[PDB]
Amino acid sequence: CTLKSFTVEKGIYQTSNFRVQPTESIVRFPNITNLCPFDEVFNATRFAS
Amino acid sequence: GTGVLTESNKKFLPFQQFGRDIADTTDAVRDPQTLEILDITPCSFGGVSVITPGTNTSNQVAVLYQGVNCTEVPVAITWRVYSTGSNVFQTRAGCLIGAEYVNNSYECDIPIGAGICASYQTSQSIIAYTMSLGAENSVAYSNNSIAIPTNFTISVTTEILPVSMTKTSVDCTMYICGD
Amino acid sequence: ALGKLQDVVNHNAQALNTLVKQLSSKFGAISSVLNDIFSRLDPPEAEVQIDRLITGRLQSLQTYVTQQLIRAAEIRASANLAATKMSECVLGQSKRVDFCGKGYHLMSFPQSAPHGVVFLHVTYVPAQEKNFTTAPAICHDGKAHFPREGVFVSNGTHWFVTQRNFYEPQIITTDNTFVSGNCDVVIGIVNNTVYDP
Amino acid sequence: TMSLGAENSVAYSNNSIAIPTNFTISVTTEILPVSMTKTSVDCTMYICGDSTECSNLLLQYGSFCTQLKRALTGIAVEQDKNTQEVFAQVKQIYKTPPIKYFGGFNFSQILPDPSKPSKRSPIEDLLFNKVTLADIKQYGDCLDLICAQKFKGLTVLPPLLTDEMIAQYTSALLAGTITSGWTFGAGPALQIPFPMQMAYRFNGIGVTQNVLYENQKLIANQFNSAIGKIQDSLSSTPSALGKLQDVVNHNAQALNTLVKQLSSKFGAISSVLNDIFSRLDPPEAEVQIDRLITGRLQSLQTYVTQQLIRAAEIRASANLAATKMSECVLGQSKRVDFCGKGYHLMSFPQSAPHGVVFLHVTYVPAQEKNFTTAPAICHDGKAHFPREGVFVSNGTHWFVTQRNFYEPQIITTDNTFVSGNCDVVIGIVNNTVYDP
Amino acid sequence: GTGVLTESNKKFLPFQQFGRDIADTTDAVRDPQTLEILDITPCSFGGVSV
Ligand SMILES: *[C@@H]1O[C@H](CO)[C@@H](O[C@@H]2O[C@H](CO)[C@@H](O)[C@H](O)[C@H]2NC(C)=O)[C@H](O)[C@H]1NC(C)=O
Ligand SMILES: *[C@@H]1O[C@H](CO)[C@@H](O[C@@H]2O[C@H](CO)[C@@H](O)[C@H](O)[C@H]2NC(C)=O)[C@H](O)[C@H]1NC(C)=O
Ligand SMILES: *[C@@H]1O[C@H](CO)[C@@H](O[C@@H]2O[C@H](CO)[C@@H](O)[C@H](O)[C@H]2NC(C)=O)[C@H](O)[C@H]1NC(C)=O
Ligand SMILES: *[C@@H]1O[C@H](CO)[C@@H](O[C@@H]2O[C@H](CO)[C@@H](O)[C@H](O)[C@H]2NC(C)=O)[C@H](O)[C@H]1NC(C)=O
Ligand SMILES: *[C@@H]1O[C@H](CO)[C@@H](O[C@@H]2O[C@H](CO)[C@@H](O)[C@H](O)[C@H]2NC(C)=O)[C@H](O)[C@H]1NC(C)=O
Ligand SMILES: *[C@@H]1O[C@H](CO)[C@@H](O[C@@H]2O[C@H](CO)[C@@H](O)[C@H](O)[C@H]2NC(C)=O)[C@H](O)[C@H]1NC(C)=O
Ligand SMILES: *[C@@H]1O[C@H](CO)[C@@H](O[C@@H]2O[C@H](CO)[C@@H](O)[C@H](O)[C@H]2NC(C)=O)[C@H](O)[C@H]1NC(C)=O
Ligand SMILES: *[C@@H]1O[C@H](CO)[C@@H](O[C@@H]2O[C@H](CO)[C@@H](O)[C@H](O)[C@H]2NC(C)=O)[C@H](O)[C@H]1NC(C)=O
Ligand SMILES: *[C@@H]1O[C@H](CO)[C@@H](O[C@@H]2O[C@H](CO)[C@@H](O)[C@H](O)[C@H]2NC(C)=O)[C@H](O)[C@H]1NC(C)=O
Numbered sequence: 036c037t038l039k040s041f042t043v044e045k046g047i048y049q050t051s052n053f054r055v056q057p058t059e060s061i062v063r064f065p066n067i068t069n070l071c072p073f074d075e076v077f078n079a080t081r082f083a084s
Numbered sequence: 085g086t087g088v089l090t091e092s093n094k095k096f097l098p099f100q101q102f103g104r105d106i107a108d109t110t111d112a113v114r115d116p117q118t119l120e121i122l123d124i125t126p127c128s129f130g131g132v133s134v135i136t137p138g139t140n141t142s143n144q145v146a147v148l149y150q151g152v153n154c155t156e157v158p159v160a161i162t163w164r165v166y167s168t169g170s171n172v173f174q175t176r177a178g179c180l181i182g183a184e185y186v187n188n189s190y191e192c193d194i195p196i197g198a199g200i201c202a203s204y205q206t207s208q209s210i211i212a213y214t215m216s217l218g219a220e221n222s223v224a225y226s227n228n229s230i231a232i233p234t235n236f237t238i239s240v241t242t243e244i245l246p247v248s249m250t251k252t253s254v255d256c257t258m259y260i261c262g263d
Numbered sequence: 264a265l266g267k268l269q270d271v272v273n274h275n276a277q278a279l280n281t282l283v284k285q286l287s288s289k290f291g292a293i294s295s296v297l298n299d300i301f302s303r304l305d306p307p308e309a310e311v312q313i314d315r316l317i318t319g320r321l322q323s324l325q326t327y328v329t330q331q332l333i334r335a336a337e338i339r340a341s342a343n344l345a346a347t348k349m350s351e352c353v354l355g356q357s358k359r360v361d362f363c364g365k366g367y368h369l370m371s372f373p374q375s376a377p378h379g380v381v382f383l384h385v386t387y388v389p390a391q392e393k394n395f396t397t398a399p400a401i402c403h404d405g406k407a408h409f410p411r412e413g414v415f416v417s418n419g420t421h422w423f424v425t426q427r428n429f430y431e432p433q434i435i436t437t438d439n440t441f442v443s444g445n446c447d448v449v450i451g452i453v454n455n456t457v458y459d460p
Numbered sequence: 461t462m463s464l465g466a467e468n469s470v471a472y473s474n475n476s477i478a479i480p481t482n483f484t485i486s487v488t489t490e491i492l493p494v495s496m497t498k499t500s501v502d503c504t505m506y507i508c509g510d511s512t513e514c515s516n517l518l519l520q521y522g523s524f525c526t527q528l529k530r531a532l533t534g535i536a537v538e539q540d541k542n543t544q545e546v547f548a549q550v551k552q553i554y555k556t557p558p559i560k561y562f563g564g565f566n567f568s569q570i571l572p573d574p575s576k577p578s579k580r581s582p583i584e585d586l587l588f589n590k591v592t593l594a595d596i597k598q599y600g601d602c603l604d605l606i607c608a609q610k611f612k613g614l615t616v617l618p619p620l621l622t623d624e625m626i627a628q629y630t631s632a633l634l635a636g637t638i639t640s641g642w643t644f645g646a647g648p649a650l651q652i653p654f655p656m657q658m659a660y661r662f663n664g665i666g667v668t669q670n671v672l673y674e675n676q677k678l679i680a681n682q683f684n685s686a687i688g689k690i691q692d693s694l695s696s697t698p699s700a701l702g703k704l705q706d707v708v709n710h711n712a713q714a715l716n717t718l719v720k721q722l723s724s725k726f727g728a729i730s731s732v733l734n735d736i737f738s739r740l741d742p743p744e745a746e747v748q749i750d751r752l753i754t755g756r757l758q759s760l761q762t763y764v765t766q767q768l769i770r771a772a773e774i775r776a777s778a779n780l781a782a783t784k785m786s787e788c789v790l791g792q793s794k795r796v797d798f799c800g801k802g803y804h805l806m807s808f809p810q811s812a813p814h815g816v817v818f819l820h821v822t823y824v825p826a827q828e829k830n831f832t833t834a835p836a837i838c839h840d841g842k843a844h845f846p847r848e849g850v851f852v853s854n855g856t857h858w859f860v861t862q863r864n865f866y867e868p869q870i871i872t873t874d875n876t877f878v879s880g881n882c883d884v885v886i887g888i889v890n891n892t893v894y895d896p
Numbered sequence: 897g898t899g900v901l902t903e904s905n906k907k908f909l910p911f912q913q914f915g916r917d918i919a920d921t922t923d924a925v926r927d928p929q930t931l932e933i934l935d936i937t938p939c940s941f942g943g944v945s946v
């Protein structure tokens with residue numbers, strides 16, 4: 036394919052590149068704990084009119 | 085990023101999170117979950133080259149993986165990568181699969197590199213051999229020893245030198261804007 | 264051995280087909296056919312697509328000319344060398360080592376070839392060497408004698424003088440050897456009789 | 461305003477002639493680049509790394525990668541050829557004699573050292589360390605300047621001939637010159653004692669072989685001392701090795717430039733390809749991406765074009781080095797200034813990183829003395845002309861001596877061939893020509 | 897396109913409609929009204945030197 040010919044002569048020819056493919060995906064938590072106080076707003080004893 | 089991830093020995097200042105090397109790619113990143121620094125190197129890559137005696141002389145071939153440790157490349161990883169049973173030789177150029185290294189030295193036929201060459205020889209198989217510089221001759225230097233030729237031979241040798249290349253002209257307009 | 268001439272033909276041919284394959288290259292356009300772009304695109308937007316194709320063809324043309332110019336210099340260097348070999352070897356005997364053949368250069372014969380010149384170098388190669396015992400000079404009558412144009416040589420019994428390239432033993436004569444100095448100064452001097460005609 | 465040089469006036473007259481009375485054997489160093497680093501570039505991941513979308517446009521853009529790979533391959537193949545022609549001149553590997561006595565001539569510095577791990581001469585080891593500042597199969601860090609290239613794909617291919625094999629070639633060339641002189645180059649090697657071989661070379665420069673023989677010890681002391689001065693001269697940091705260093709610096713500068721062109725936007729919104737694909741929509745991404753590929757492609761083309769021009773210069777140097785190998789090292793060369801300065805006696809080759817260092821042994825006349833001279837001598841009505849010397853007048857008696865060294869001889873019929881008459885020639889001086 | 901048109905001797909398969917050269921430019925085509933394979937070649941060109 037690389038030589039684009041059916042016959043190939045004596046010698047050494049660079050043809051392609053081999054690469055290892057990623058096994059799986061990783062995403063990283065920033066350890067964020069800035070949770071919203073909407074819960075106690077939801078868990079409110081009284082609501083406005 | 086995409087690459088194999090390992091621990092990082094190099095220290096990081098508190099403000100800096102990731103580090104880019106002289107290649108300007110991030111070579112070390114600190115884990116957001118656990119502030120420990122980790123070293124990132126890309127997944128192993130390399131180019132492949134095929135050593136072939138020629139289509140006339142059988143279809144047996146040997147392939148060399150440039151600049152890659154023999155243990156680095158698995159036998160599984162499009163091609164079957166032959167097999168571990170196939171002879172594996174580790175060279176400075178890289179890992180070579182499918183050729184027998186021999187201790188006999190022969191004149192180069194296909195240059196693998198770093199003093200290694202391969203050829204199709206018989207039970208014909210591809211064999212990798214160390215370069216043979218030439219025949220070893222020792223000439224006896226002495227205080228009073230001289231050699232004088234008693235005969236001569238007339239030899240004719242051929243030298244071939246390119247002189248001219250095919251003159252070429254280009255009609256620019258029809259190549260760029262044809263018809 | 265004509266592969267060098269063959270390579271010149273292959274490089275010019277292969278580069279020429281390369282320019283042809285670059286025509287089919289899209290260069291980011293819609294089609295590689297210029298007339299198709301004109302039919303498929305109205306003039307305002309067509310200019311954007313045509314320009315991308317135009318530089319793509321232009322860049323390929325520029326690269327081919329640059330490759331040819333570098334190739335032309337390589338051939339010109341070979342041609343200048345070949346012209347020098349024409350004069351230095353064919354037109355006369357050259358004492359430059361290995362310039363004209365291997366060994367001592369007797370002559371050279373030129374033969375024409377397609378897009379090149381083939382040189383047939385006639386060379387003198389010594390053979391059938393025979394070892395000998397030699398001395399820097401011969402002490403005969405208290406004056407050191409040096410070989411004028413030869414080398415002092417004995418096979419074991421009698422000293423002789425011969426030309427360096429070929430073994431031809433001549434008896435030591437006054438005409439054969441020029442005399443200077445005394446015997447003691449020269450190291451390795453060997454006693455022998457210098458015959459006077 | 462710079463000085464062109466010192467101003468010296470040489471007194472010219474009809475009668476005045478200067479004949480040297482002493483000689484200085486000088487050894488000079490010539491450094492010639494022979495090869496450059498063979499570089500191969502993975503086109504796709506130079507253009508874009510882990511960019512599946514970019515592979516589509518790159519394939520659509522054309523097959524530009526094939527020519528760049530082919531052009532780089534031609535340079536790499538040619539580089540290995542250059543070292544082959546320069547060094548592999550002699551087919552037969554020659555071994556140095558176990559005896560190191562060569563009539564007082566000391567070759568320890570240029571001869572390979574068995575004690576040193578690499579079979580290299582002390583000069584060669586010094587040459588390597590001077591250039592070793594510019595130069596990883598383990599790639600333990602990288603699975604560090606080398607990785608900055610392979611992380612982008614710019615890869616260095618090891619030379620086909622390693623340094624030890626080159627060192628073996630140089631030692632073989634050294635053995636042939638010492639043992640056989642010029643004979644090993646033309647044909648089969650013929651042993652000849654070294655004082656005779658140097659005496660032969662003295663005849664080549666025009667000095668009779670006797671002059672060397674009486675002054676053998678003085679020449680040996682001069683030659684041995686001259687070799688020593690080369691070591692400290694090479695040990696001096698300002699050196700001609702920069703020419704070899706320029707080749708590696710040129711390779712390094714080009715490799716860094718390609719790295720910068722990656723960060724170069726070429727007018728793009730962001731240098732990073734990931735930003736192009738992420739923020740913008742696929743329609744907007746293509747326009748920004750296409751400009752990036754064109755800029756990356758142009759940088760690769762300029763690098764290959766520049767590399768081809770630089771490779772041609774090395775080829776011209778390699779051809780010059782190969783010619784210097786055959787013309788000077790293998791045999792005595794009459795071409796003036798081709799090998800060293802002054803009359804060339806012989807040359808010694810020493811391998812260097814990516815180059816070869818030539819040690820030219822040259823004959824330099826010294827201690828010249830003025831003399832009065834006549835074109836011919838009239839003795840008995842027929843003019844006499846010196847056969848191979850010059851008529852030199854001591855001021856009281858005339859003498860004939862060789863033209864490169866002062867050795868006065870009494871005029872004899874053998875010394876001077878007779879021709880013509882006395883009146884025709886101008887400046888002929890009356891004298892007596894002794895007949896043996 | 898612009899060119900000179902002659903009857904094409906190239907044997908042309910029933911499913912095949914277009915022919916392309918090494919450069920992949922269209923060199924043969926079948927007429928729409930009646931399927932007639934016709935080779936297309938460029939009109940005569942040539943450099944001129946004075
Ligand atoms: C001339 O002198 C002697 C005669 O035999 C040779 O010395 C030995 O020659 C053999 C083969 O030629 C070598 O293998 C030995 O190594 C030589 N002896 C030593 C001590 O080295 C010498 O070689 C002869 N010269 C030639 C050109 O044949
Ligand atoms: C030449 O013969 C001499 C022997 O006379 C040797 O060379 C050196 O000679 C001196 C004085 O006799 C000794 O002190 C040295 O030891 C000799 N050199 C060596 C290396 O031993 C030697 O035998 C001959 N040289 C050759 C053949 O190159
Ligand atoms: C020198 O030249 C050649 C050797 O290279 C010799 O010629 C050969 O001589 C033998 C016997 O006389 C013949 O059988 C061969 O056919 C000859 N060969 C050729 C090519 O002619 C010649 O005899 C040698 N002479 C000396 C004195 O060495
Ligand atoms: C070394 O010198 C010469 C050259 O061969 C030899 O002397 C000749 O020997 C033959 C043999 O009897 C005689 O017929 C000649 O008349 C001799 N010539 C002269 C000029 O004397 C001598 O024999 C050689 N040495 C050996 C050991 O062979
Ligand atoms: C040989 O003698 C002549 C005559 O004295 C020298 O010519 C003069 O030399 C002196 C010093 O050497 C210079 O200052 C003069 O300029 C020379 N004369 C002229 C006209 O230039 C000559 O130089 C002597 N040869 C050598 C080698 O010193
Ligand atoms: C060399 O000798 C000649 C005398 O033959 C002088 O040079 C010139 O010679 C011509 C012809 O005899 C005279 O016409 C000139 O007048 C001479 N020139 C001078 C300056 O004398 C001269 O004696 C010598 N040349 C020198 C010393 O340069
Ligand atoms: C020529 O050779 C050198 C200058 O090139 C000189 O010889 C010196 O002689 C003195 C006297 O003993 C020694 O101390 C020096 O060592 C010698 N020089 C060297 C380099 O060894 C002198 O000018 C001339 N000598 C002769 C013998 O002609
Ligand atoms: C050739 O020269 C070298 C260099 O001077 C000599 O080696 C030196 O030998 C002395 C005494 O053995 C040591 O102190 C030096 O350190 C040595 N120098 C080196 C660079 O090795 C060597 O002996 C000389 N050989 C001959 C035959 O003259
Ligand atoms: C010219 O050279 C000769 C020879 O060297 C010198 O004359 C010699 O002088 C000594 C005593 O002074 C005599 O014993 C010799 O017989 C002389 N030789 C001849 C050939 O007569 C003379 O001194 C030199 N001339 C000059 C000007 O130095």
Ligand SMILES: *[C@@H]1O[C@H](CO)[C@@H](O[C@@H]2O[C@H](CO)[C@@H](O)[C@H](O)[C@H]2NC(C)=O)[C@H](O)[C@H]1NC(C)=O
Nearest residue numbers: 834837838839840841882883887888889890891
């Ligand atoms: C060398 O000597 C000859 C002969 O002595 C000189 O020739 C002249 O010949 C004429 C006619 O025979 C005579 O006047 C004298 O015999 C010579 N004249 C002079 C002035 O010597 C010749 O001139 C002399 N050459 C030199 C340079 O002195």
Ligand SMILES: *[C@@H]1O[C@H](CO)[C@@H](O)[C@H](O)[C@H]1NC(C)=O
Nearest residue numbers: 042045137138139140141142
């Ligand atoms: C190439 O193939 C032909 C045809 O099979 C054969 O005759 C020839 O020997 C082959 N060349 C080599 C070098 O094997």
Ligand SMILES: *[C@@H]1O[C@H](CO)[C@@H](O)[C@H](O)[C@H]1NC(C)=O
Nearest residue numbers: 184185186187188189213214
């Ligand atoms: C050849 O050399 C290798 C190491 O270089 C060694 O392992 C082997 O035993 C030697 N002999 C053979 C026959 O391979």
Ligand SMILES: *[C@@H]1O[C@H](CO)[C@@H](O)[C@H](O)[C@H]1NC(C)=O
Nearest residue numbers: 402403446451452453454455
């Ligand atoms: C040659 O013979 C003379 C005469 O006896 C002698 O003085 C000299 O030493 C001899 N030389 C040699 C090398 O034997």
Ligand SMILES: *[C@@H]1O[C@H](CO)[C@@H](O)[C@H](O)[C@H]1NC(C)=O
Nearest residue numbers: 153154155156174175597598
């Ligand atoms: C390949 O890796 C192994 C261990 O991982 C190591 O021992 C060997 O030296 C490496 N090969 C090369 C050529 O560096």
Ligand SMILES: *[C@@H]1O[C@H](CO)[C@@H](O)[C@H](O)[C@H]1NC(C)=O
Nearest residue numbers: 913926927928929930931932
């Ligand atoms: C129009 O072309 C079609 C086939 O291409 C066919 O009906 C006929 O050849 C043409 N019609 C007329 C009326 O000529």
